[PDB]
Amino acid sequence: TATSDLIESLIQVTRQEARRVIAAIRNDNVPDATIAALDKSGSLIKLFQRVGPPELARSLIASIAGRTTMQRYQARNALIRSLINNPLGTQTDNWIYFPTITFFDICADLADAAGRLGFAAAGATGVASQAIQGPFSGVGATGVNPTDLPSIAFGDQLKLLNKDPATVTKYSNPLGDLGAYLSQLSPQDKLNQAQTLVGQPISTLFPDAYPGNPPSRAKVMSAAARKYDLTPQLIGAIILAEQRDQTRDEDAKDYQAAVSIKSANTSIGLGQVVVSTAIKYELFTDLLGQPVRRGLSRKAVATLLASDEFNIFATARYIRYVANLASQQDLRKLPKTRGAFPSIDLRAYAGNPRNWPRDNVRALASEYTSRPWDDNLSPGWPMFVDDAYATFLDPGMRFP
Amino acid sequence: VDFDKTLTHPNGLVVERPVGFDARRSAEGFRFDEGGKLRNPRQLEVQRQDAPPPPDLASRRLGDGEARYKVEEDDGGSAGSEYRLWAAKPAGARWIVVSASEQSEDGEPTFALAWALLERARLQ
Ligand SMILES: [Ca+2]
Ligand SMILES: [Ca+2]
Ligand SMILES: [Ca+2]
């Protein structure tokens, strides 16, 4: 192929040469044929060996794994062979909890899933908030990945370990009175937050797994909605509520505590999914195949929860789980639930949110922030999520 | 400060209300729910109990006496696991029991307010 020829002609290369080769692989119309040619000539292994440092290797590997099908396993083998004298591979920086071949496999599965589920294509571009303090300063607002945040100061790590109240408070949910938080925002302020949240590109740990630029969060949310018979308005409401009750500091703690020596069971990312819960309910089922999933370390799971597409899918899958569970309950056994949400319709939960009473959205909100269907309810989360939902119902809000 | 209004049960239990909590009377004591409409309100109850605690619970120093207790944890939601403390201290030939709950995504809560409440309580 033209691409394999170009690559062989350029065969550590400079950063310029590497970016050229990667660009060529990504613009290739016949990725499989190109890989076959390179595998035959023996130049593929050379490509993998000569493209470093890890940043560039990640781009190359993600591109190849994502675009190949008939030749993907030969590519994987060539990569493996190239790693014989390079134990480090792509296992650095944000990706230190992914063995290099796991990185390859994640990129492959994700590309396939984005294609299959309908969130591969880009189209939004911006724009993110510049906030770094206060409510709505987490990744939902800012697009700054929790894995990119600077290490928390050592002394703060120690005080957090010892449960020092001031320090714990600094790194925890910023909101007390939820009603008051909402009442200070105009309807336009609220729409602005929702649009900022869903309109910006996903903050992803695997950008080159996509055929082009990463998709908007809205595109991924619509895909998840289709997969789990939800709506992007509902997924959006749950996430916007979480992200209002989120700061940059909390993002830093959420992730760093999860991957520390303590392996903390924090709620992480857009939908604030708990690590052990992602594991227990296999919340990445529809993006990653069983072999990858069975291989993932706990810290790899936490890290994935910091990647927006994995998090959105996990969030949606969990929402559908909570709804299905509700649809199996006996309302007579949930008198407090009936008291708080007297128009709740448990059977309706089995179907699409377009047909749920609003009391169903309120109840599910309680049972997303807390243990689900135990008849113990959050007094404030239902109204908080319901306000977000109302915002997403605004005709100014459009999803793919 | 932690406490304001002095509350007195007909059964002789006397304790001060935690500041910012709504208080109601229960069968053998008082129930406190954190005020407002919060995401994850603390919930506490303090009661006279005449029967001794179950045997072989963990113990801790409380004031000049001891207390026996157990904390349980379960999956909750995005605000973290659900945690509940049950603790008892002697009061003469009887006991005072505090139970308390809150969610935490950062491991077991200190339950500092519940322990302060248990220490503050007395039987008349
Ligand atoms: Ca939060
Ligand atoms: Ca969190
Ligand atoms: Ca609940």
Tokens of B68: 């026996």
Chain B within 8 Å of A319 (Cβ-Cβ)? no
Q: Tell me: cis bond preceding A382? Omega within 30 of 0 counts.
A: no
Per-residue 3-state assignment (H helix, E strand, C coil) for chain B: CCEEEEEECCCCEEEEEECCEEEEECCCEEEEEECCCCCCCCEEEEEEECCCCCCCCEEEEECCEEEEEEEEEEEEECCEEEEEEEEEEEECCEEEEEEEEEEECCCCCCCHHHHHHHHHCEEC
Dihedral sign of CA atoms A348, A398, A134, B106 in order: positive
This PDB structure is determined at a resolution in Å of: 1.9
Q: Name the percent of chain A in helix, strand, coil, to the closest 5.
A: 60, 0, 35
**β-pair partners for B43:** B33, B101
Rounded CA gap, A22 and A40, in Å? 19
Classify A259 as helix, strand or coil.
helix
Provide the chain A residues 164-203 that lie in CB contact (below 8 A) with chain B: 165, 168, 172-173, 175-179
CA of A309 to the centre of ligand 3 (A): 27
Q: How far B87 CA lies from chain A's nearest CA (Å)?
A: 20
Residues 238-267 in A contacting B (C-alpha not used; CB under 8 Å): 242, 245, 253-254, 257, 262, 264-267
Interface contact flag, B38 A380, Cβ < 8 Å: yes
A264 Cα to chain B: minimum distance (Å): 7
The DSSP secondary-structure symbol of B31 reads E
Q: How far is the CA of B62 from the centre of ligand 1 (A)?
A: 33
Three-state secondary structure call for residue B37 = coil
> Ligand 1: distance of its center to the CA of B51 in Å?
41
Q: Indicate if the alpha-carbon torsion angle A47, A48, A54, A57 is positive or negative.
A: positive
Interface with A, mutate which of B73, B105, B113 (most A CBs under 10 A): B105
- CB of A228 within 8 Å of a chain B CB? The answer is no
Could you tell me the two tokens for B72? 């349980």
Task: Read off the amino acid at residue A53.
Answer: P
Q: Is B31 exposed, middle or buried (0-12, 13-18, 19+ CB in 10 A)?
A: middle
> Residue B109, Cβ neighbours under 10 Å: how many?
23
Residues with their C more than 2.5 Å from the N of the next written residue in chain A, i.e. before a break, are 11
Could you give all domains of chain B from N- to C-terminal order, each with its CATH number?
1-124 (2.60.120.1690)
The answer, for B10 touching chain A at a CB cutoff of 8 Å, is: no
Measure the CA–CA gap between A207 and A145, rounded to whole angstroms: 13
Q: Technique behind this structure?
A: X-ray
Q: How many residues does chain B have?
A: 124
> With an 8 Å Cβ cutoff, is B74 touching chain A?
yes
